[PDB]
Amino acid sequence: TLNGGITDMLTELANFEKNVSQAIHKYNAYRKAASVIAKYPHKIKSGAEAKKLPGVGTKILEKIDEFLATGKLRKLEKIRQDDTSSSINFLTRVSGIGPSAARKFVDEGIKTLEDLRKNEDKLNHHQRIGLKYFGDFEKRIPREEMLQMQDIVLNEVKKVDSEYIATVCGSFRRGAESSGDMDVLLTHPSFTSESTKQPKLLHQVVEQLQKVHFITDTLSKGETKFMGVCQLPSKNDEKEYPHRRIDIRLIPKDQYYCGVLYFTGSDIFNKNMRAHALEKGFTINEYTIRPLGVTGVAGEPLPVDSEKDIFDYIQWKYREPKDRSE
DNA sequence: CCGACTGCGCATCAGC
DNA sequence: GCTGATGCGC
DNA sequence: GTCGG
Numbered sequence: 001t002l003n004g005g006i007t008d009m010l011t012e013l014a015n016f017e018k019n020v021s022q023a024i025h026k027y028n029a030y031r032k033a034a035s036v037i038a039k040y041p042h043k044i045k046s047g048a049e050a051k052k053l054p055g056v057g058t059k060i061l062e063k064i065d066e067f068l069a070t071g072k073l074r075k076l077e078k079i080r081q082d083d084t085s086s087s088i089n090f091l092t093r094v095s096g097i098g099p100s101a102a103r104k105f106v107d108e109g110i111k112t113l114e115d116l117r118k119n120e121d122k123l124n125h126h127q128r129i130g131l132k133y134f135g136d137f138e139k140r141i142p143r144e145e146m147l148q149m150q151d152i153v154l155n156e157v158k159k160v161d162s163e164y165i166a167t168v169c170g171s172f173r174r175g176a177e178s179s180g181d182m183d184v185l186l187t188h189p190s191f192t193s194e195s196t197k198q199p200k201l202l203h204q205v206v207e208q209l210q211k212v213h214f215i216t217d218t219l220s221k222g223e224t225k226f227m228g229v230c231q232l233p234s235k236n237d238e239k240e241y242p243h244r245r246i247d248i249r250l251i252p253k254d255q256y257y258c259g260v261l262y263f264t265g266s267d268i269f270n271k272n273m274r275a276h277a278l279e280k281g282f283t284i285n286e287y288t289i290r291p292l293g294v295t296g297v298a299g300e301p302l303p304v305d306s307e308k309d310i311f312d313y314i315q316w317k318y319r320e321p322k323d324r325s326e
Numbered sequence: 327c328c329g330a331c332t333g334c335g336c337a338t339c340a341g342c
Numbered sequence: 343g344c345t346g347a348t349g350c351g352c
Numbered sequence: 353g354t355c356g357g
């Protein structure tokens with residue numbers, strides 16, 4: 001990667017602002033600058049050259065100059081030496097522990113994996129599962145395992161009702177050679193924007209995946225969104241596979257294209273594309289694209305027959321999933 | 327100079 | 343219980 | 353932290 005030193009710096013700065021400063025717009029500004037620099041096809045020689053790119057302003061250009069001259073950023077060197085920042089950043093690596101809870105735990109003297117492990121009763125259910133699988137959730141998933149997981153999920157969904165359609169999205173659908181988790185978009189003709197003619201549509205699928213011991217834990221679960229934990233089966237004498245995060249999102253079948261656009265991402269790609277829609281007078285979510293009136297009020301959903309239709313409304317050339325990894 | 331920054335489901339809690 | 347934040351992770 | 357008007 002051509003500018004990895006710079007993008008790593010900006011990412012660590014983004015994480016500092018989110019986790020410690022609790023400054024969500026600085027976090028997003030740093031992530032935006034990292035993303036645009038990551039796609040820039042030249043090795044950056046100067047902060048001024050970087051400042052040409054949209055999202056790199058004066059302050060990041062200065063940081064880039066410092067990094068290029070010295071190989072480091074004093075601001076980050078000091079953050080790394082600060083105990084409270086160090087503790088908060090570590091605690092937020094547990095799934096379910098965010099900026100707020102991390103800072104509250106540090107106040108209470110809970111500041112290490114050992115402290116968490118002996119204070120399990122101070123964790124909510126999500127945090128408790130996050131701690132249990134702390135090590136596993138740091139491991140990435142090779143695409144070859146994602147293919148096995150996909151096969152299980154699709155076949156088990158088929159056994160519940162052959163009219164379900166499950167689509168693995170996320171980085172997998174963008175063609176990545178490894179993924180951080182598995183994201184599954186689910187549809188069924190009974191659930192549309194017009195009516196829900198069968199209950200428990202998501203529950204049935206989760207239950208079947210639990211039945212065959214693929215889903216092992218639940219982080220949260222409602223009528224349309226499941227977040228939990230899964231594990232591939234292993235063979236005789238073989239070490240067990242790590243536990244993996246799995247998300248399942250049930251979307252109205254007639255809104256599949258907005259939903260698969262959303263769940264394919266990346267997150268920054270969605271953010272960039274939704275920001276462009278707003279400039280063009282539309283708002284995009286995982287359900288619909290709608291015009292915005294002058295009052296800022298969204299209007300009726302526009303018809304959508306493909307992912308490209310959504311690109312067309314906002315006057316973007318279509319981008320294949322493999323080219324949305326921003 | 328400064329308002330606006332993508333969008334939302336599920337968990338948790340406060341106030342009534 | 344309901345309603346409306348706030349937190350969190352997508 | 354960045355940027356459009």
Ligand SMILES: Nc1ncnc2c1ncn2[C@H]1C[C@H](O)[C@@H](COP(=O)(O)OP(=O)(O)C(Br)(Br)P(=O)(O)O)O1
Binds near residue numbers: 352
């Ligand atoms: N804040 C956000 N805003 C808009 N869309 C978002 C979003 N967060 C997530 N999405 C959309 C967009 C996103 O692609 C999808 C899945 O969210 P994952 O967190 O699983 O992201 P992924 O791409 O699968 C990665 Br590379 Br992080 P992996 O999980 O393989 O490590 O939900």
Ligand SMILES: [Cl-]
Binds near residue numbers: 022023024025026
């Ligand atoms: Cl901010």
Ligand SMILES: [Cl-]
Binds near residue numbers: 285287
């Ligand atoms: Cl909508």
Ligand SMILES: [Mg+2]
Binds near residue numbers: 171181
């Ligand atoms: Mg994912």
Ligand code: NA
Binds near residue numbers: 054055
């Ligand atoms: Na710029």
Ligand code: NA
Binds near residue numbers: 091098
């Ligand atoms: Na966390």
Ligand code: NA
Binds near residue numbers: 170246352
């Ligand atoms: Na996910």
